[PDB]
């Protein structure tokens, strides 16, 4: 249900920092939500961490491209363990 | 002609968010035209921001209901009203931020002056205080490394006021500004001691200009151009509008 | 810096527009929101909501200008022409101007901007021939500009008294007048020991 | 004279200020005149050496009361003039950098001195700190143009594929037009994808 | 004036004729000859930023400010005859600000009066030009050419204001 979090995803990337995001990356964000199947209220901080990594490395609009966003996923996932 | 108008009156004598918006808009005009930074009206913005937050939240609730008559015209009016209010607040905030940057050194010395009649916190708000401090620190580091490290100590001073040109700079109190004489804030005119009738019995707020050593009779409901210094009190008293 | 230079010491025409829209205005709703004693509600914050939820078709009322314009963009509202915006009123003001070259007329502080807005998005409502109204407004503008130049002839450090000058004209002339006054005061003060 | 280099530097500063102001669209600032700054710094160091030797001679007392008085004062004045020139140039560059940050970064690194680059990064950090937290509801980086129009029709200037929205998705297809509320797509317009 | 005001710095850079009242050694570098010693009554033109302070300090000041050409009798005569026709730019780029600086240095009331006149008179035509928006004329072009830097700046500001007024007013 990527569209359900589409409002929050928009406010977290393209309105939180103005980072444009594709819809397929929205579906990938939904799959990552499934990964963190628990309450997604605190997943917002995780999304912001992904945003920070993207703004540090990728730095391209429509970030939710389900592929570049995918790379951001594994990278943030990596650091998420390192920590 | 028994004047019962008082009798009919007494017989009739038997925090509006709209008002808050009007106050904000007046304050924003004053900030835009004022040379000095005006005392941040904390309570007004506090209440306005609270109202904005709750308004946006309930608008989102109506949006959810729509997802779940159904005329959207009021919804559009909400969206535009929030946009306009947010725009005004942003304009005011950015204006005062730029002003802070302009006279950062003047603010620094005022805060440093323990005899300062005003505390920096009184004028700047919390976020403004933080921004001023951090920005001043960053700029200080940049200039330090770029130039001062070469510069000898006697000239390494950044806030120096002894050189031929004082590095610290302050708003021109004497800057001319457009002004309108609002008159007394209330309908009670004789209440205010400053107000007094004049030629043709027209009230004015007479104010001497010391530089020229002259007097000006600013009639109510009129427009004039005066040095900001001469009006500081009246505008602070709200008798006049900083056009 | 948080504020562009062109906005540093004045308001662009757009800000003037906005502050004008903050005002209310007569209108004739083409809708009846007022729910009979026998539902979406506005519930605004910065302006009144009581009237909005009591709209009744073809019943004059006041609303903040921008709401009125929003509705007028739809067919659901009609903007009532302000009384001062009438051939008789404009002619009277013109005659007063010619009668008193020294003084400006008592037009609404927002007459120019309001007239422009209505002309652009309220041509239908205007009862009088719109072209005549535009022409008379232009003539008033010309006369006021001439008087502005005449007043400028007497620019002085002491002070100025624009009196009935309209807000739009004031914003137009702000930079020049303010700067000239500043330089003159600087010179005179420097003369002072 | 020592002030000549500072005069050239401030002339460059004025030229770049006029460059930015005259050009309505934001313009990348010119190259840092590292050579001129280094030369002025060398002059300042030479003046420092001269002042130290002058103090040495004062200990020698070669007509110090007048000769050393005047020489020390003039050296200090020249050094202060150079200081002011450098400060003005650097401050102008800093302010233009801040304008760039507010305009776009909130929403040409080679030209910037590494100190300037660090300062700009810090300024961006500061801005994002401000818009984050209290007052977040309003987007300080948002446009300073009033939102006169509730709804605006827009044609995608550059195709970039579908994009997400709070409650929708916009398919950016070259020469495709959208009728949507201005606020939603203002960021895209600032990004140049959208026209009118 | 602001310490970081570009125009202020540039104006201060401008030098003026001056003469020494002492024969200080080790200052011939002011004459581009560090070896030589400065001599009393040495007619030297010096930067404003420097010359000012030198005049202040000395009692007999170390240096005297000579009446500069820009404030020559000829200049005031021309100003009084015709402000507008005068090419203030030719006589100097920053004539006004420097005149204010002079008046501050010496309270020369007549000079202030002449400057105030010049300012008002030229400002009248400057406003006329700036208001005459083209729906670059040669007349306004030459007026701009005679225009000073500060006059140029104010003209640009006023012209931009008028342009915005027209743009928003005639066009949506």
Short mmCIF file of N, CA, C and O in Angstrom, two decimals, chain E residues 55-147:
data_model
loop_
_atom_site.label_atom_id
_atom_site.label_comp_id
_atom_site.label_asym_id
_atom_site.label_seq_id
_atom_site.Cartn_x
_atom_site.Cartn_y
_atom_site.Cartn_z
N UNK E 55 45.67 64.37 8.71
CA UNK E 55 45.22 65.72 9.05
C UNK E 55 44.82 65.80 10.51
O UNK E 55 45.12 66.79 11.19
N UNK E 56 44.13 64.78 11.02
CA UNK E 56 43.67 64.82 12.40
C UNK E 56 44.86 64.89 13.36
O UNK E 56 44.86 65.68 14.31
N UNK E 57 45.89 64.08 13.11
CA UNK E 57 47.00 63.95 14.05
C UNK E 57 48.07 64.99 13.75
O UNK E 57 48.13 65.54 12.64
N UNK E 58 48.92 65.26 14.73
CA UNK E 58 49.99 66.23 14.59
C UNK E 58 51.04 66.11 15.67
O UNK E 58 52.09 66.76 15.61
N UNK E 59 48.87 72.91 18.34
CA UNK E 59 49.45 71.77 17.63
C UNK E 59 49.39 71.94 16.11
O UNK E 59 48.50 72.60 15.60
N UNK E 60 50.35 71.34 15.41
CA UNK E 60 50.45 71.43 13.96
C UNK E 60 50.25 70.03 13.39
O UNK E 60 51.04 69.13 13.70
N UNK E 61 49.23 69.81 12.56
CA UNK E 61 49.03 68.47 12.00
C UNK E 61 50.19 68.06 11.11
O UNK E 61 50.88 68.89 10.52
N UNK E 62 50.42 66.75 11.03
CA UNK E 62 51.53 66.25 10.23
C UNK E 62 51.35 66.60 8.76
O UNK E 62 52.34 66.75 8.03
N UNK E 63 50.11 66.76 8.30
CA UNK E 63 49.83 67.03 6.89
C UNK E 63 48.64 67.97 6.80
O UNK E 63 47.81 68.05 7.71
N UNK E 64 48.56 68.69 5.69
CA UNK E 64 47.48 69.63 5.41
C UNK E 64 46.71 69.15 4.19
O UNK E 64 47.32 68.68 3.22
N UNK E 65 45.39 69.28 4.22
CA UNK E 65 44.56 68.98 3.06
C UNK E 65 44.43 70.23 2.20
O UNK E 65 43.89 71.25 2.64
N UNK E 66 44.93 70.15 0.97
CA UNK E 66 44.80 71.27 0.06
C UNK E 66 43.42 71.26 -0.59
O UNK E 66 42.82 70.19 -0.76
N UNK E 67 42.89 72.41 -0.97
CA UNK E 67 41.57 72.45 -1.60
C UNK E 67 41.58 71.72 -2.92
O UNK E 67 42.21 72.17 -3.89
N UNK E 68 40.89 70.58 -3.02
CA UNK E 68 40.94 69.79 -4.25
C UNK E 68 40.20 70.47 -5.39
O UNK E 68 39.29 71.28 -5.20
N UNK E 69 40.60 70.11 -6.61
CA UNK E 69 39.98 70.68 -7.80
C UNK E 69 38.48 70.43 -7.80
O UNK E 69 37.71 71.32 -8.18
N UNK E 70 38.05 69.24 -7.39
CA UNK E 70 36.63 68.93 -7.43
C UNK E 70 35.81 69.93 -6.63
O UNK E 70 34.62 70.13 -6.89
N UNK E 71 36.44 70.58 -5.65
CA UNK E 71 35.82 71.69 -4.93
C UNK E 71 36.49 73.01 -5.30
O UNK E 71 36.62 73.90 -4.45
N UNK E 72 36.92 73.14 -6.54
CA UNK E 72 37.48 74.40 -7.02
C UNK E 72 36.37 75.41 -7.27
O UNK E 72 35.21 75.05 -7.52
N UNK E 73 36.73 76.69 -7.20
CA UNK E 73 35.76 77.75 -7.47
C UNK E 73 35.06 77.51 -8.80
O UNK E 73 33.85 77.70 -8.92
N UNK E 74 35.82 77.07 -9.81
CA UNK E 74 35.23 76.78 -11.11
C UNK E 74 34.09 75.77 -10.97
O UNK E 74 33.04 75.91 -11.59
N UNK E 75 34.30 74.74 -10.15
CA UNK E 75 33.30 73.70 -10.01
C UNK E 75 32.01 74.26 -9.43
O UNK E 75 30.92 73.98 -9.94
N UNK E 76 32.12 75.05 -8.36
CA UNK E 76 30.91 75.61 -7.77
C UNK E 76 30.23 76.58 -8.73
O UNK E 76 29.00 76.66 -8.79
N UNK E 77 31.02 77.35 -9.48
CA UNK E 77 30.44 78.24 -10.47
C UNK E 77 29.62 77.45 -11.48
O UNK E 77 28.47 77.80 -11.79
N UNK E 78 30.19 76.37 -11.99
CA UNK E 78 29.47 75.53 -12.95
C UNK E 78 28.21 74.96 -12.32
O UNK E 78 27.14 74.96 -12.93
N UNK E 79 28.32 74.49 -11.08
CA UNK E 79 27.16 73.92 -10.40
C UNK E 79 26.04 74.94 -10.31
O UNK E 79 24.89 74.67 -10.65
N UNK E 80 26.37 76.15 -9.85
CA UNK E 80 25.36 77.18 -9.69
C UNK E 80 24.75 77.56 -11.03
O UNK E 80 23.54 77.81 -11.13
N UNK E 81 25.57 77.62 -12.07
CA UNK E 81 25.06 77.99 -13.39
C UNK E 81 24.07 76.95 -13.91
O UNK E 81 22.95 77.29 -14.31
N UNK E 82 24.47 75.68 -13.91
CA UNK E 82 23.62 74.64 -14.48
C UNK E 82 23.93 73.29 -13.83
O UNK E 82 24.91 72.63 -14.20
N UNK E 83 23.12 72.84 -12.87
CA UNK E 83 23.38 71.54 -12.25
C UNK E 83 23.26 70.39 -13.23
O UNK E 83 24.14 69.52 -13.30
N UNK E 84 22.17 70.37 -14.00
CA UNK E 84 21.88 69.22 -14.85
C UNK E 84 22.97 69.03 -15.89
O UNK E 84 23.49 67.93 -16.09
N UNK E 85 23.33 70.12 -16.58
CA UNK E 85 24.31 70.00 -17.66
C UNK E 85 25.65 69.50 -17.14
O UNK E 85 26.40 68.85 -17.88
N UNK E 86 25.97 69.78 -15.88
CA UNK E 86 27.26 69.38 -15.33
C UNK E 86 27.44 67.88 -15.42
O UNK E 86 26.54 67.11 -15.09
N UNK E 87 28.62 67.46 -15.89
CA UNK E 87 28.97 66.04 -15.95
C UNK E 87 29.71 65.65 -14.67
O UNK E 87 30.93 65.57 -14.60
N UNK E 88 28.91 65.41 -13.63
CA UNK E 88 29.48 65.04 -12.34
C UNK E 88 30.35 63.79 -12.46
O UNK E 88 31.35 63.65 -11.75
N UNK E 89 29.98 62.88 -13.36
CA UNK E 89 30.78 61.67 -13.53
C UNK E 89 32.19 62.02 -13.99
O UNK E 89 33.17 61.45 -13.49
N UNK E 90 32.31 62.95 -14.93
CA UNK E 90 33.63 63.32 -15.43
C UNK E 90 34.51 63.86 -14.32
O UNK E 90 35.66 63.42 -14.15
N UNK E 91 34.00 64.83 -13.55
CA UNK E 91 34.81 65.41 -12.48
C UNK E 91 35.20 64.33 -11.48
O UNK E 91 36.30 64.37 -10.91
N UNK E 92 34.32 63.36 -11.24
CA UNK E 92 34.65 62.28 -10.34
C UNK E 92 33.56 61.22 -10.41
O UNK E 92 32.42 61.51 -10.77
N UNK E 93 33.94 59.99 -10.05
CA UNK E 93 32.97 58.91 -10.00
C UNK E 93 32.08 59.02 -8.77
O UNK E 93 30.87 58.78 -8.84
N UNK E 94 32.66 59.39 -7.63
CA UNK E 94 31.96 59.40 -6.35
C UNK E 94 31.90 60.81 -5.77
O UNK E 94 32.08 61.00 -4.56
N UNK E 95 31.63 61.80 -6.62
CA UNK E 95 31.71 63.19 -6.19
C UNK E 95 30.87 63.48 -4.95
O UNK E 95 31.33 64.13 -4.02
N UNK E 96 29.62 63.00 -4.93
CA UNK E 96 28.74 63.32 -3.81
C UNK E 96 29.31 62.82 -2.50
O UNK E 96 29.68 63.61 -1.62
N UNK E 97 29.43 61.50 -2.36
CA UNK E 97 29.88 60.93 -1.09
C UNK E 97 31.15 61.60 -0.61
O UNK E 97 31.31 61.90 0.57
N UNK E 98 32.08 61.87 -1.54
CA UNK E 98 33.31 62.53 -1.15
C UNK E 98 33.06 63.96 -0.70
O UNK E 98 33.76 64.45 0.19
N UNK E 99 32.09 64.64 -1.29
CA UNK E 99 31.74 65.98 -0.83
C UNK E 99 31.20 65.94 0.59
O UNK E 99 31.54 66.79 1.43
N UNK E 100 30.35 64.96 0.88
CA UNK E 100 29.86 64.79 2.25
C UNK E 100 31.03 64.52 3.19
O UNK E 100 31.08 65.05 4.30
N UNK E 101 31.97 63.68 2.76
CA UNK E 101 33.14 63.41 3.60
C UNK E 101 33.93 64.69 3.86
O UNK E 101 34.36 64.94 4.99
N UNK E 102 34.13 65.50 2.83
CA UNK E 102 34.80 66.78 3.00
C UNK E 102 34.08 67.64 4.02
O UNK E 102 34.69 68.15 4.97
N UNK E 103 32.77 67.80 3.85
CA UNK E 103 32.00 68.65 4.75
C UNK E 103 32.12 68.14 6.18
O UNK E 103 32.24 68.92 7.12
N UNK E 104 32.09 66.82 6.36
CA UNK E 104 32.31 66.26 7.68
C UNK E 104 33.68 66.64 8.20
O UNK E 104 33.84 67.03 9.37
N UNK E 105 34.70 66.55 7.35
CA UNK E 105 36.05 66.92 7.75
C UNK E 105 36.13 68.40 8.10
O UNK E 105 36.76 68.77 9.09
N UNK E 106 35.50 69.26 7.29
CA UNK E 106 35.45 70.69 7.55
C UNK E 106 34.02 71.15 7.39
O UNK E 106 33.42 70.94 6.33
N UNK E 107 33.48 71.79 8.42
CA UNK E 107 32.10 72.25 8.36
C UNK E 107 31.99 73.45 7.43
O UNK E 107 31.98 74.60 7.88
N UNK E 108 31.91 73.18 6.13
CA UNK E 108 31.88 74.22 5.10
C UNK E 108 30.44 74.38 4.65
O UNK E 108 29.97 73.70 3.73
N UNK E 109 29.73 75.30 5.30
CA UNK E 109 28.28 75.40 5.12
C UNK E 109 27.91 75.71 3.68
O UNK E 109 27.05 75.05 3.09
N UNK E 110 28.55 76.73 3.10
CA UNK E 110 28.26 77.09 1.71
C UNK E 110 28.39 75.88 0.79
O UNK E 110 27.56 75.68 -0.11
N UNK E 111 29.42 75.07 1.00
CA UNK E 111 29.60 73.88 0.19
C UNK E 111 28.41 72.94 0.35
O UNK E 111 27.91 72.37 -0.62
N UNK E 112 27.95 72.77 1.59
CA UNK E 112 26.79 71.93 1.83
C UNK E 112 25.56 72.46 1.10
O UNK E 112 24.79 71.68 0.52
N UNK E 113 25.37 73.77 1.12
CA UNK E 113 24.22 74.36 0.43
C UNK E 113 24.30 74.08 -1.07
O UNK E 113 23.31 73.68 -1.69
N UNK E 114 25.48 74.28 -1.65
CA UNK E 114 25.64 74.06 -3.08
C UNK E 114 25.37 72.60 -3.42
O UNK E 114 24.72 72.28 -4.41
N UNK E 115 25.90 71.69 -2.59
CA UNK E 115 25.72 70.27 -2.84
C UNK E 115 24.24 69.91 -2.74
O UNK E 115 23.72 69.13 -3.55
N UNK E 116 23.55 70.44 -1.74
CA UNK E 116 22.13 70.15 -1.58
C UNK E 116 21.36 70.61 -2.80
O UNK E 116 20.50 69.89 -3.33
N UNK E 117 21.64 71.83 -3.27
CA UNK E 117 21.01 72.31 -4.49
C UNK E 117 21.26 71.32 -5.62
O UNK E 117 20.33 70.66 -6.09
N UNK E 118 22.52 71.16 -6.00
CA UNK E 118 22.88 70.21 -7.05
C UNK E 118 22.09 68.91 -6.92
O UNK E 118 21.51 68.43 -7.90
N UNK E 119 22.08 68.33 -5.72
CA UNK E 119 21.42 67.06 -5.52
C UNK E 119 19.95 67.15 -5.90
O UNK E 119 19.46 66.34 -6.69
N UNK E 120 19.24 68.14 -5.36
CA UNK E 120 17.81 68.24 -5.63
C UNK E 120 17.55 68.47 -7.11
O UNK E 120 16.70 67.80 -7.72
N UNK E 121 18.29 69.40 -7.71
CA UNK E 121 18.06 69.74 -9.11
C UNK E 121 18.28 68.53 -10.00
O UNK E 121 17.43 68.20 -10.84
N UNK E 122 19.40 67.84 -9.83
CA UNK E 122 19.67 66.68 -10.68
C UNK E 122 18.71 65.55 -10.37
O UNK E 122 18.35 64.78 -11.27
N UNK E 123 18.27 65.42 -9.12
CA UNK E 123 17.33 64.37 -8.76
C UNK E 123 16.01 64.57 -9.47
O UNK E 123 15.34 63.60 -9.84
N UNK E 124 15.60 65.82 -9.65
CA UNK E 124 14.36 66.07 -10.39
C UNK E 124 14.41 65.41 -11.77
O UNK E 124 13.51 64.64 -12.14
N UNK E 125 15.46 65.69 -12.53
CA UNK E 125 15.56 65.13 -13.87
C UNK E 125 15.81 63.63 -13.83
O UNK E 125 15.37 62.89 -14.71
N UNK E 126 16.53 63.17 -12.80
CA UNK E 126 16.74 61.73 -12.66
C UNK E 126 15.41 61.02 -12.51
O UNK E 126 15.17 59.98 -13.14
N UNK E 127 14.52 61.57 -11.68
CA UNK E 127 13.20 60.99 -11.52
C UNK E 127 12.41 61.07 -12.81
O UNK E 127 11.73 60.12 -13.20
N UNK E 128 12.48 62.22 -13.49
CA UNK E 128 11.82 62.32 -14.78
C UNK E 128 12.24 61.19 -15.70
O UNK E 128 11.41 60.50 -16.29
N UNK E 129 13.55 60.96 -15.82
CA UNK E 129 14.05 59.92 -16.71
C UNK E 129 13.57 58.55 -16.25
O UNK E 129 13.01 57.77 -17.03
N UNK E 130 13.78 58.23 -14.97
CA UNK E 130 13.42 56.91 -14.48
C UNK E 130 11.94 56.62 -14.68
O UNK E 130 11.56 55.48 -14.94
N UNK E 131 11.09 57.64 -14.56
CA UNK E 131 9.66 57.43 -14.73
C UNK E 131 9.30 57.23 -16.20
O UNK E 131 8.31 56.55 -16.50
N UNK E 132 10.09 57.78 -17.12
CA UNK E 132 9.79 57.70 -18.54
C UNK E 132 10.17 56.32 -19.07
O UNK E 132 11.10 56.14 -19.86
N UNK E 133 9.43 55.32 -18.60
CA UNK E 133 9.65 53.95 -19.05
C UNK E 133 9.31 53.82 -20.53
O UNK E 133 8.32 54.38 -21.01
N UNK E 134 10.14 53.07 -21.25
CA UNK E 134 9.87 52.78 -22.65
C UNK E 134 8.82 51.68 -22.74
O UNK E 134 9.02 50.58 -22.21
N UNK E 135 7.70 51.98 -23.39
CA UNK E 135 6.60 51.04 -23.49
C UNK E 135 7.06 49.79 -24.24
O UNK E 135 8.14 49.76 -24.81
N UNK E 136 16.46 52.81 -24.95
CA UNK E 136 17.43 53.71 -24.34
C UNK E 136 17.56 54.99 -25.16
O UNK E 136 18.32 55.05 -26.12
N UNK E 137 16.80 56.02 -24.77
CA UNK E 137 16.84 57.29 -25.47
C UNK E 137 18.20 57.95 -25.31
O UNK E 137 18.91 57.72 -24.33
N UNK E 138 18.56 58.79 -26.28
CA UNK E 138 19.86 59.45 -26.25
C UNK E 138 19.91 60.49 -25.13
O UNK E 138 20.94 60.66 -24.48
N UNK E 139 18.81 61.22 -24.91
CA UNK E 139 18.81 62.24 -23.87
C UNK E 139 19.02 61.62 -22.49
O UNK E 139 19.90 62.03 -21.73
N UNK E 140 18.21 60.61 -22.16
CA UNK E 140 18.41 59.92 -20.89
C UNK E 140 19.74 59.19 -20.87
O UNK E 140 20.33 59.02 -19.80
N UNK E 141 20.24 58.78 -22.04
CA UNK E 141 21.55 58.14 -22.09
C UNK E 141 22.65 59.10 -21.65
O UNK E 141 23.49 58.76 -20.81
N UNK E 142 22.65 60.32 -22.19
CA UNK E 142 23.65 61.30 -21.78
C UNK E 142 23.45 61.72 -20.33
O UNK E 142 24.42 61.95 -19.61
N UNK E 143 22.19 61.82 -19.90
CA UNK E 143 21.94 62.14 -18.50
C UNK E 143 22.52 61.06 -17.59
O UNK E 143 23.13 61.36 -16.56
N UNK E 144 22.36 59.80 -17.98
CA UNK E 144 22.98 58.70 -17.25
C UNK E 144 24.50 58.82 -17.28
O UNK E 144 25.17 58.58 -16.27
N UNK E 145 25.06 59.16 -18.43
CA UNK E 145 26.51 59.25 -18.55
C UNK E 145 27.07 60.31 -17.60
O UNK E 145 28.07 60.08 -16.92
N UNK E 146 26.42 61.47 -17.55
CA UNK E 146 26.80 62.47 -16.56
C UNK E 146 26.48 62.02 -15.14
O UNK E 146 27.00 62.59 -14.18
N UNK E 147 25.64 61.00 -15.00
CA UNK E 147 25.21 60.54 -13.69
C UNK E 147 26.38 59.96 -12.90
O UNK E 147 27.25 59.29 -13.46
#
